[PDB]
Amino acid sequence: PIEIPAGVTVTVNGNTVTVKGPKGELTRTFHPDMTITVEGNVITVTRPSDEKHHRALHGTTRSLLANMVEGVSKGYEKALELVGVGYRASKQGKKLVLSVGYSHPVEIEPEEGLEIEVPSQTKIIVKGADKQRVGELAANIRAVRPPEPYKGKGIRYEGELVRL
Amino acid sequence: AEFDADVIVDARDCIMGRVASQVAEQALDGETVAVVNAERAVITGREEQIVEKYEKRVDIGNDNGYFYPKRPDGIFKRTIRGMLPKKQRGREAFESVRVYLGNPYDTLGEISETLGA
Amino acid sequence: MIQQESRLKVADNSGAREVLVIKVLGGSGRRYANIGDVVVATVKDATPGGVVKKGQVVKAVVVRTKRGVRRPDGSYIRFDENACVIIRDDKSPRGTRIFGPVARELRDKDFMKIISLAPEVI
Amino acid sequence: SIKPTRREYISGIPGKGIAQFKMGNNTYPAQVENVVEKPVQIRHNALEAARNAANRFVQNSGKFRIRKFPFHVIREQDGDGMRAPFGKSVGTAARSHGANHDFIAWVNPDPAVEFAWRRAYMKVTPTVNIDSSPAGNA
Amino acid sequence: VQGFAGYKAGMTPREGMETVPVTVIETPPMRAVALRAYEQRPLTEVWTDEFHSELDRTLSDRLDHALDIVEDGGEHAMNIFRAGEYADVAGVTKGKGTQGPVKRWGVQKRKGKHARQGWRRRIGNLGPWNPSRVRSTVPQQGQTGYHQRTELNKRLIDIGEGGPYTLVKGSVPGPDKRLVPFFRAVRPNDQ
Amino acid sequence: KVRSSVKKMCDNCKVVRRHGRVLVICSNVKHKQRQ
RNA sequence: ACCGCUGAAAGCAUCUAAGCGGGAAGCCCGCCCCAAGAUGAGGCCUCCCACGGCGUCAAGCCGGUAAGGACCCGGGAAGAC
RNA sequence: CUCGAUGUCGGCUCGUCGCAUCCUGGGGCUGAAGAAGGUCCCAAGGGUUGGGCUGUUCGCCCAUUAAAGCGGCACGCGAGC
RNA sequence: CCAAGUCUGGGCUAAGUGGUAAAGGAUGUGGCGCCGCGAAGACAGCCAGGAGGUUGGCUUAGAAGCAGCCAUCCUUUAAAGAGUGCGUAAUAGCUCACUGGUCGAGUGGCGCCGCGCCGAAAAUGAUGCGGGGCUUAAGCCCAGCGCCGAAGCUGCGGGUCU
């Protein structure tokens, strides 16, 4: 039960939902094992089960959709924290070049779609087009570089804390 | 390649059961059934534990050996052949049936492949 | 070469005479004490109680073996005898002095200490 | 149901050795209690115990009453080996006739004792049934 | 023919800087017979006679560059194998034959007090009581000397022509001089 | 850890189902409940 | 095992059923060693051409074709034979 | 079942499974910083040494080691000692 | 595989349970009763004070909910919190058990069940009897329906004793 604001070109074929937009050019999938919902100016949930089970099944899609959108129009953003009294980073090459001891930093690449940003060496973050494909990779590096909360330092999901 | 047109059939979706069942049925009587489809085929949901059982055909290796085919092709091998005995007719009855992948002559593609497909 | 209870004299003065070969030092399996190598044996007998004394738990290394050592220099070397030197956990001799020559070896596996004390290293 | 040799020739006339009945406190209505369904020469000891540990965790008001008590017993190894077996006693109890009035957690509003007994069941052995009485438990 | 190969020259070491023993190997270009491809259908080996004079007394790089020398007319000089390289060779065991479970297969024999007793060579045992008759496990006097032996990390040092021949890093060609040697540097690790 | 017999620590430690499996979860290394 | 992302049913959370990834001296593959007698006898190249007379679906009896092989001899780290 | 008969301890050799795993990797836990330990979940590949004294296994002792594993199969093996 | 309905009816499974196991766990799932409320506009979200005499007794060197043994009451007022809770040296912040705006229509609780997943680790190699089977697959429960199949019972005919 939602919307499809400005530009959300929507094509639900075979079970795939093709969503074209601004900086959100995206083609996602969406179950045939249920009921689609679209009307050119809105859209929503279809009851191919109405029953608790599948109920949620779409009770998820809903979001799912919600994603396509917000994703297709305003792309997504993951806020990362660079907390290292030694570690540090600042883009380099078509990827990121973080560092945190060891000896060989590392170059990480946001394959077509994903795209990282070095607002300022210390902190960084990613802006993709699919919260999905984002949060993941977004993190898949947030760890990539041990956050070790033994006493404070390392890659950490924005809004963390400490320890003892 | 090309052959007769005697037992002209295929596969896909159906229930990888009675499926073969008759295959033979006419596998018996005295007929040749050359079809194909493998992948398309079909069989019990529960994929998972689905691909298990036949991986039980997978690494079921007994010094004395115990191959256990690794392409749809088989799956049907076993099974079917299962329907029959092993004295003459039966046997032969196993050469008389024949299937294949995509298509040579005018969930059933995962366990295999899976364990070999 | 040189294990179980093969015996070998001293050339240093540690206060020894000869020593039985318990283990070949290094790690499991292993079956051999070849100069440079380090042995886990004891006194078969030692002077009149210099500082060591007969039957004393010990640690010594390889420097004289008639087993013949093939020098990477496709060369060959051996001796009329088989014996070595004691040591202080710290691959460090005791004998203040040396005796019969020895072989580059040592150096290669650490010991100078004797390397030079030696009357002659062959 | 093999039982013993007689109430005064083999082994009959004891105290069975245990830790008496009543505990907790009164209570006119509130029906708080415990019973079973299992059949078993209720393991004396195990028994005695159990119940007790019950008090161990509570203390005062909650009919820590308990309507059980063994009074006969088994026997086995003593003498030659395995053949013509005489008898050496040990371990009396009582048949928990396939369920019945166990012990009672009886009192006005004092579940602080229900949980108790509870702790009492946990223990025990043969499963046990958690229950209430005429009215329930308040 | 996918590869490169010839026979055993012999062994000897000598020189270097520390010194090192190898082995000699004979083989110019033993011509080029068709070439591997399963195109349009089943293709593998042809034969447009162009061989020796006697032979009718019995009448994609590797293989590729081949095309280079196998179409030249037949032969094909050996030696990309250059200065410091790791092919691999597959000799032919050595008519050693049928021997006792002794050398055939490492094993301790007749000990002392009975390590002689006109006693000696002969395995210890087979299978227990309950287990079941036998295993295809314990080898046996499994003849040797014929095996299609070979190995790995086969480093070649140098070569020269006067007679197309190769010098090797540690021999162990398996079979004997004048023997059938085939080399390669397969899934090298020293790479 | 306890494989067998898990039941709610912290006043939160959740009840989750992975592989029909039931493995305790709650904001504490001191809860890593699993069976 | 073990760790995560995207998110239902529980309008708040959850590695989760469905969607996508992380992760082992381990499995599959890869590296050597057989090996179609795997009766599903596999591929391919390079040779040899229609001989005789007899009743037959004579797919049966003879000269053959060194295409070719053999046997006997002489020899092999090939080897009991 | 066997007395018209299944030759029994330990050793030797040749081993083969199994996992509750001793060494070994992977993990989560800790009253874990490091390092080293403890706790428990996943994995058997490979591997798991010389002597001593004892008929012994077991076991204590000596020098190692990553380790110096628990147990199967008539507590494997006498038509093999 | 081997003869006989991939019968029909209406439930329940989503683990291959069926194809061996107990004490013991858990908003699994499906069907039954209870306490409180959604226009004192309800539980989970969110704004805020996150009230004062409460800083009472053993031990105090520190109970002063957040060491532990006993209390568990009063309040001026929007009500309360015998302040269940992370802590530190006791004190010192948050959290509902307390409710306004914003939504707005079903939200939390125990009893009764029928189905089901962890506990449930083994030695040659693997197992429903085998091939196999996930709304006639098939399993399991309750309903009607027709076929199989003994040397048993009818038909055929002989046998034979009382």
Side-chain angles (χ1 to χ4, degrees), chain E residues 39-53:
Chain E
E39 323 84 33
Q40 309 186 30
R41 268 185 172 175
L43 282 192
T44 59
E45 353 99 25
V46 172
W47 313 105
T48 66
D49 281 40
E50 326 161 26
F51 337 100
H52 276 86
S53 84

mmCIF file with all atom_site columns, all heavy atoms in Angstrom, chain E residues 39-53:
data_model
loop_
_atom_site.group_PDB
_atom_site.id
_atom_site.type_symbol
_atom_site.label_atom_id
_atom_site.label_alt_id
_atom_site.label_comp_id
_atom_site.label_asym_id
_atom_site.label_entity_id
_atom_site.label_seq_id
_atom_site.pdbx_PDB_ins_code
_atom_site.Cartn_x
_atom_site.Cartn_y
_atom_site.Cartn_z
_atom_site.occupancy
_atom_site.B_iso_or_equiv
_atom_site.pdbx_formal_charge
_atom_site.auth_seq_id
_atom_site.auth_comp_id
_atom_site.auth_asym_id
_atom_site.auth_atom_id
_atom_site.pdbx_PDB_model_num
ATOM 1   N N   . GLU E 1 39 ? 36.117 -30.646 -33.593 1.00 0.00 ? 39 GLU E N   1
ATOM 2   C CA  . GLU E 1 39 ? 35.231 -29.836 -34.413 1.00 0.00 ? 39 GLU E CA  1
ATOM 3   C C   . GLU E 1 39 ? 34.173 -30.698 -35.094 1.00 0.00 ? 39 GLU E C   1
ATOM 4   O O   . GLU E 1 39 ? 33.472 -31.471 -34.439 1.00 0.00 ? 39 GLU E O   1
ATOM 5   C CB  . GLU E 1 39 ? 36.040 -29.061 -35.459 1.00 0.00 ? 39 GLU E CB  1
ATOM 6   C CG  . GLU E 1 39 ? 37.390 -28.556 -34.959 1.00 0.00 ? 39 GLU E CG  1
ATOM 7   C CD  . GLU E 1 39 ? 38.484 -29.612 -35.051 1.00 0.00 ? 39 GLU E CD  1
ATOM 8   O OE1 . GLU E 1 39 ? 38.442 -30.439 -35.987 1.00 0.00 ? 39 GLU E OE1 1
ATOM 9   O OE2 . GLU E 1 39 ? 39.391 -29.607 -34.190 1.00 0.00 ? 39 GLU E OE2 1
ATOM 10  N N   . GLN E 1 40 ? 32.881 -29.787 -35.843 1.00 0.00 ? 40 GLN E N   1
ATOM 11  C CA  . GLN E 1 40 ? 31.837 -30.227 -36.759 1.00 0.00 ? 40 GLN E CA  1
ATOM 12  C C   . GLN E 1 40 ? 31.378 -31.634 -36.397 1.00 0.00 ? 40 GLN E C   1
ATOM 13  O O   . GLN E 1 40 ? 30.241 -32.021 -36.665 1.00 0.00 ? 40 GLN E O   1
ATOM 14  C CB  . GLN E 1 40 ? 32.339 -30.179 -38.209 1.00 0.00 ? 40 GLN E CB  1
ATOM 15  C CG  . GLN E 1 40 ? 32.959 -28.840 -38.604 1.00 0.00 ? 40 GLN E CG  1
ATOM 16  C CD  . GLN E 1 40 ? 33.324 -28.760 -40.077 1.00 0.00 ? 40 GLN E CD  1
ATOM 17  O OE1 . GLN E 1 40 ? 32.689 -29.394 -40.924 1.00 0.00 ? 40 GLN E OE1 1
ATOM 18  N NE2 . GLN E 1 40 ? 34.345 -27.969 -40.393 1.00 0.00 ? 40 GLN E NE2 1
ATOM 19  N N   . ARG E 1 41 ? 32.278 -32.389 -35.774 1.00 0.00 ? 41 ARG E N   1
ATOM 20  C CA  . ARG E 1 41 ? 31.997 -33.757 -35.348 1.00 0.00 ? 41 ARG E CA  1
ATOM 21  C C   . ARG E 1 41 ? 33.183 -34.306 -34.563 1.00 0.00 ? 41 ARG E C   1
ATOM 22  O O   . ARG E 1 41 ? 33.889 -33.551 -33.890 1.00 0.00 ? 41 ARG E O   1
ATOM 23  C CB  . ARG E 1 41 ? 31.708 -34.657 -36.554 1.00 0.00 ? 41 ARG E CB  1
ATOM 24  C CG  . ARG E 1 41 ? 30.235 -34.762 -36.946 1.00 0.00 ? 41 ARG E CG  1
ATOM 25  C CD  . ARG E 1 41 ? 30.048 -35.770 -38.079 1.00 0.00 ? 41 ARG E CD  1
ATOM 26  N NE  . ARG E 1 41 ? 28.641 -36.039 -38.368 1.00 0.00 ? 41 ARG E NE  1
ATOM 27  C CZ  . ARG E 1 41 ? 28.219 -36.799 -39.376 1.00 0.00 ? 41 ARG E CZ  1
ATOM 28  N NH1 . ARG E 1 41 ? 29.095 -37.367 -40.192 1.00 0.00 ? 41 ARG E NH1 1
ATOM 29  N NH2 . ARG E 1 41 ? 26.919 -36.988 -39.567 1.00 0.00 ? 41 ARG E NH2 1
ATOM 30  N N   . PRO E 1 42 ? 33.402 -35.628 -34.646 1.00 0.00 ? 42 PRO E N   1
ATOM 31  C CA  . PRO E 1 42 ? 34.545 -36.267 -34.006 1.00 0.00 ? 42 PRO E CA  1
ATOM 32  C C   . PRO E 1 42 ? 35.811 -36.196 -34.862 1.00 0.00 ? 42 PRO E C   1
ATOM 33  O O   . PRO E 1 42 ? 35.915 -36.886 -35.879 1.00 0.00 ? 42 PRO E O   1
ATOM 34  C CB  . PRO E 1 42 ? 34.086 -37.720 -33.853 1.00 0.00 ? 42 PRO E CB  1
ATOM 35  C CG  . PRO E 1 42 ? 33.151 -37.939 -34.998 1.00 0.00 ? 42 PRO E CG  1
ATOM 36  C CD  . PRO E 1 42 ? 32.546 -36.599 -35.353 1.00 0.00 ? 42 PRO E CD  1
ATOM 37  N N   . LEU E 1 43 ? 36.759 -35.358 -34.453 1.00 0.00 ? 43 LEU E N   1
ATOM 38  C CA  . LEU E 1 43 ? 38.051 -35.276 -35.127 1.00 0.00 ? 43 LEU E CA  1
ATOM 39  C C   . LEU E 1 43 ? 39.199 -35.443 -34.139 1.00 0.00 ? 43 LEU E C   1
ATOM 40  O O   . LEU E 1 43 ? 39.135 -34.954 -33.011 1.00 0.00 ? 43 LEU E O   1
ATOM 41  C CB  . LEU E 1 43 ? 38.192 -33.955 -35.884 1.00 0.00 ? 43 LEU E CB  1
ATOM 42  C CG  . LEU E 1 43 ? 37.449 -33.877 -37.219 1.00 0.00 ? 43 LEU E CG  1
ATOM 43  C CD1 . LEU E 1 43 ? 37.904 -32.653 -37.999 1.00 0.00 ? 43 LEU E CD1 1
ATOM 44  C CD2 . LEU E 1 43 ? 37.670 -35.148 -38.029 1.00 0.00 ? 43 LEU E CD2 1
ATOM 45  N N   . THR E 1 44 ? 40.247 -36.138 -34.572 1.00 0.00 ? 44 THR E N   1
ATOM 46  C CA  . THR E 1 44 ? 41.375 -36.439 -33.697 1.00 0.00 ? 44 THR E CA  1
ATOM 47  C C   . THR E 1 44 ? 42.679 -36.740 -34.448 1.00 0.00 ? 44 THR E C   1
ATOM 48  O O   . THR E 1 44 ? 43.631 -35.960 -34.381 1.00 0.00 ? 44 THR E O   1
ATOM 49  C CB  . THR E 1 44 ? 41.046 -37.607 -32.738 1.00 0.00 ? 44 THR E CB  1
ATOM 50  O OG1 . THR E 1 44 ? 40.715 -38.779 -33.495 1.00 0.00 ? 44 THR E OG1 1
ATOM 51  C CG2 . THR E 1 44 ? 39.870 -37.240 -31.839 1.00 0.00 ? 44 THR E CG2 1
ATOM 52  N N   . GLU E 1 45 ? 42.726 -37.863 -35.161 1.00 0.00 ? 45 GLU E N   1
ATOM 53  C CA  . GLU E 1 45 ? 43.962 -38.284 -35.823 1.00 0.00 ? 45 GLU E CA  1
ATOM 54  C C   . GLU E 1 45 ? 43.775 -38.645 -37.298 1.00 0.00 ? 45 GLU E C   1
ATOM 55  O O   . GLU E 1 45 ? 43.017 -39.557 -37.631 1.00 0.00 ? 45 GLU E O   1
ATOM 56  C CB  . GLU E 1 45 ? 44.583 -39.482 -35.089 1.00 0.00 ? 45 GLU E CB  1
ATOM 57  C CG  . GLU E 1 45 ? 43.903 -39.858 -33.777 1.00 0.00 ? 45 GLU E CG  1
ATOM 58  C CD  . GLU E 1 45 ? 42.942 -41.026 -33.929 1.00 0.00 ? 45 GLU E CD  1
ATOM 59  O OE1 . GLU E 1 45 ? 43.133 -41.836 -34.862 1.00 0.00 ? 45 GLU E OE1 1
ATOM 60  O OE2 . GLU E 1 45 ? 41.999 -41.138 -33.118 1.00 0.00 ? 45 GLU E OE2 1
ATOM 61  N N   . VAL E 1 46 ? 44.476 -37.933 -38.179 1.00 0.00 ? 46 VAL E N   1
ATOM 62  C CA  . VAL E 1 46 ? 44.523 -38.292 -39.596 1.00 0.00 ? 46 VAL E CA  1
ATOM 63  C C   . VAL E 1 46 ? 45.901 -38.851 -39.930 1.00 0.00 ? 46 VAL E C   1
ATOM 64  O O   . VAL E 1 46 ? 46.714 -39.077 -39.036 1.00 0.00 ? 46 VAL E O   1
ATOM 65  C CB  . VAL E 1 46 ? 44.225 -37.084 -40.507 1.00 0.00 ? 46 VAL E CB  1
ATOM 66  C CG1 . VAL E 1 46 ? 44.481 -37.442 -41.964 1.00 0.00 ? 46 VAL E CG1 1
ATOM 67  C CG2 . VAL E 1 46 ? 42.793 -36.614 -40.317 1.00 0.00 ? 46 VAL E CG2 1
ATOM 68  N N   . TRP E 1 47 ? 46.167 -39.074 -41.214 1.00 0.00 ? 47 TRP E N   1
ATOM 69  C CA  . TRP E 1 47 ? 47.468 -39.600 -41.625 1.00 0.00 ? 47 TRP E CA  1
ATOM 70  C C   . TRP E 1 47 ? 47.701 -39.493 -43.134 1.00 0.00 ? 47 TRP E C   1
ATOM 71  O O   . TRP E 1 47 ? 47.396 -40.417 -43.888 1.00 0.00 ? 47 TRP E O   1
ATOM 72  C CB  . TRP E 1 47 ? 47.628 -41.048 -41.153 1.00 0.00 ? 47 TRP E CB  1
ATOM 73  C CG  . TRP E 1 47 ? 47.231 -41.253 -39.715 1.00 0.00 ? 47 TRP E CG  1
ATOM 74  C CD1 . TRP E 1 47 ? 46.092 -41.849 -39.257 1.00 0.00 ? 47 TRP E CD1 1
ATOM 75  C CD2 . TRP E 1 47 ? 47.965 -40.844 -38.550 1.00 0.00 ? 47 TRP E CD2 1
ATOM 76  N NE1 . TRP E 1 47 ? 46.074 -41.846 -37.883 1.00 0.00 ? 47 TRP E NE1 1
ATOM 77  C CE2 . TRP E 1 47 ? 47.212 -41.235 -37.424 1.00 0.00 ? 47 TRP E CE2 1
ATOM 78  C CE3 . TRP E 1 47 ? 49.188 -40.191 -38.351 1.00 0.00 ? 47 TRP E CE3 1
ATOM 79  C CZ2 . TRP E 1 47 ? 47.639 -40.994 -36.120 1.00 0.00 ? 47 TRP E CZ2 1
ATOM 80  C CZ3 . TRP E 1 47 ? 49.609 -39.954 -37.054 1.00 0.00 ? 47 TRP E CZ3 1
ATOM 81  C CH2 . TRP E 1 47 ? 48.837 -40.354 -35.956 1.00 0.00 ? 47 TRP E CH2 1
ATOM 82  N N   . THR E 1 48 ? 48.247 -38.355 -43.554 1.00 0.00 ? 48 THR E N   1
ATOM 83  C CA  . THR E 1 48 ? 48.571 -38.109 -44.957 1.00 0.00 ? 48 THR E CA  1
ATOM 84  C C   . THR E 1 48 ? 50.004 -38.544 -45.258 1.00 0.00 ? 48 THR E C   1
ATOM 85  O O   . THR E 1 48 ? 50.868 -37.714 -45.549 1.00 0.00 ? 48 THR E O   1
ATOM 86  C CB  . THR E 1 48 ? 48.410 -36.620 -45.312 1.00 0.00 ? 48 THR E CB  1
ATOM 87  O OG1 . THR E 1 48 ? 49.379 -35.845 -44.596 1.00 0.00 ? 48 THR E OG1 1
ATOM 88  C CG2 . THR E 1 48 ? 47.015 -36.135 -44.950 1.00 0.00 ? 48 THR E CG2 1
ATOM 89  N N   . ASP E 1 49 ? 50.241 -39.849 -45.192 1.00 0.00 ? 49 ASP E N   1
ATOM 90  C CA  . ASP E 1 49 ? 51.588 -40.408 -45.295 1.00 0.00 ? 49 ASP E CA  1
ATOM 91  C C   . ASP E 1 49 ? 52.648 -39.416 -45.778 1.00 0.00 ? 49 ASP E C   1
ATOM 92  O O   . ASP E 1 49 ? 52.505 -38.779 -46.825 1.00 0.00 ? 49 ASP E O   1
ATOM 93  C CB  . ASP E 1 49 ? 51.597 -41.694 -46.136 1.00 0.00 ? 49 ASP E CB  1
ATOM 94  C CG  . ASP E 1 49 ? 51.114 -42.912 -45.354 1.00 0.00 ? 49 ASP E CG  1
ATOM 95  O OD1 . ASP E 1 49 ? 50.151 -42.780 -44.571 1.00 0.00 ? 49 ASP E OD1 1
ATOM 96  O OD2 . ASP E 1 49 ? 51.695 -44.007 -45.524 1.00 0.00 ? 49 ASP E OD2 1
ATOM 97  N N   . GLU E 1 50 ? 53.708 -39.300 -44.985 1.00 0.00 ? 50 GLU E N   1
ATOM 98  C CA  . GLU E 1 50 ? 54.832 -38.412 -45.250 1.00 0.00 ? 50 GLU E CA  1
ATOM 99  C C   . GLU E 1 50 ? 55.946 -38.790 -44.275 1.00 0.00 ? 50 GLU E C   1
ATOM 100 O O   . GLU E 1 50 ? 56.902 -38.037 -44.080 1.00 0.00 ? 50 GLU E O   1
ATOM 101 C CB  . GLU E 1 50 ? 54.423 -36.957 -45.022 1.00 0.00 ? 50 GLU E CB  1
ATOM 102 C CG  . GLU E 1 50 ? 52.982 -36.646 -45.385 1.00 0.00 ? 50 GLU E CG  1
ATOM 103 C CD  . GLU E 1 50 ? 52.483 -35.366 -44.740 1.00 0.00 ? 50 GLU E CD  1
ATOM 104 O OE1 . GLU E 1 50 ? 53.318 -34.488 -44.435 1.00 0.00 ? 50 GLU E OE1 1
ATOM 105 O OE2 . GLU E 1 50 ? 51.258 -35.242 -44.534 1.00 0.00 ? 50 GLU E OE2 1
ATOM 106 N N   . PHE E 1 51 ? 55.808 -39.974 -43.676 1.00 0.00 ? 51 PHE E N   1
ATOM 107 C CA  . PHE E 1 51 ? 56.627 -40.413 -42.538 1.00 0.00 ? 51 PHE E CA  1
ATOM 108 C C   . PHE E 1 51 ? 58.104 -40.677 -42.872 1.00 0.00 ? 51 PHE E C   1
ATOM 109 O O   . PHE E 1 51 ? 58.716 -39.955 -43.661 1.00 0.00 ? 51 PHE E O   1
ATOM 110 C CB  . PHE E 1 51 ? 56.020 -41.672 -41.896 1.00 0.00 ? 51 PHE E CB  1
ATOM 111 C CG  . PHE E 1 51 ? 54.540 -41.853 -42.153 1.00 0.00 ? 51 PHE E CG  1
ATOM 112 C CD1 . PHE E 1 51 ? 54.095 -42.726 -43.139 1.00 0.00 ? 51 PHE E CD1 1
ATOM 113 C CD2 . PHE E 1 51 ? 53.597 -41.174 -41.398 1.00 0.00 ? 51 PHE E CD2 1
ATOM 114 C CE1 . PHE E 1 51 ? 52.740 -42.905 -43.376 1.00 0.00 ? 51 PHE E CE1 1
ATOM 115 C CE2 . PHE E 1 51 ? 52.241 -41.348 -41.631 1.00 0.00 ? 51 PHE E CE2 1
ATOM 116 C CZ  . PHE E 1 51 ? 51.813 -42.216 -42.622 1.00 0.00 ? 51 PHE E CZ  1
ATOM 117 N N   . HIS E 1 52 ? 58.661 -41.716 -42.251 1.00 0.00 ? 52 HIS E N   1
ATOM 118 C CA  . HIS E 1 52 ? 60.051 -42.135 -42.466 1.00 0.00 ? 52 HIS E CA  1
ATOM 119 C C   . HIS E 1 52 ? 60.259 -42.807 -43.830 1.00 0.00 ? 52 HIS E C   1
ATOM 120 O O   . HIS E 1 52 ? 59.993 -42.213 -44.876 1.00 0.00 ? 52 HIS E O   1
ATOM 121 C CB  . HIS E 1 52 ? 60.483 -43.118 -41.372 1.00 0.00 ? 52 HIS E CB  1
ATOM 122 C CG  . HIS E 1 52 ? 60.956 -42.466 -40.111 1.00 0.00 ? 52 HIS E CG  1
ATOM 123 N ND1 . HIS E 1 52 ? 60.099 -42.077 -39.104 1.00 0.00 ? 52 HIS E ND1 1
ATOM 124 C CD2 . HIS E 1 52 ? 62.204 -42.160 -39.680 1.00 0.00 ? 52 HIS E CD2 1
ATOM 125 C CE1 . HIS E 1 52 ? 60.796 -41.549 -38.115 1.00 0.00 ? 52 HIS E CE1 1
ATOM 126 N NE2 . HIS E 1 52 ? 62.076 -41.586 -38.441 1.00 0.00 ? 52 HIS E NE2 1
ATOM 127 N N   . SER E 1 53 ? 60.749 -44.047 -43.795 1.00 0.00 ? 53 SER E N   1
ATOM 128 C CA  . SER E 1 53 ? 60.919 -44.885 -44.985 1.00 0.00 ? 53 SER E CA  1
ATOM 129 C C   . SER E 1 53 ? 60.628 -46.321 -44.577 1.00 0.00 ? 53 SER E C   1
ATOM 130 O O   . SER E 1 53 ? 60.289 -47.176 -45.397 1.00 0.00 ? 53 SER E O   1
ATOM 131 C CB  . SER E 1 53 ? 62.354 -44.806 -45.503 1.00 0.00 ? 53 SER E CB  1
ATOM 132 O OG  . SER E 1 53 ? 63.192 -45.712 -44.801 1.00 0.00 ? 53 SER E OG  1
#
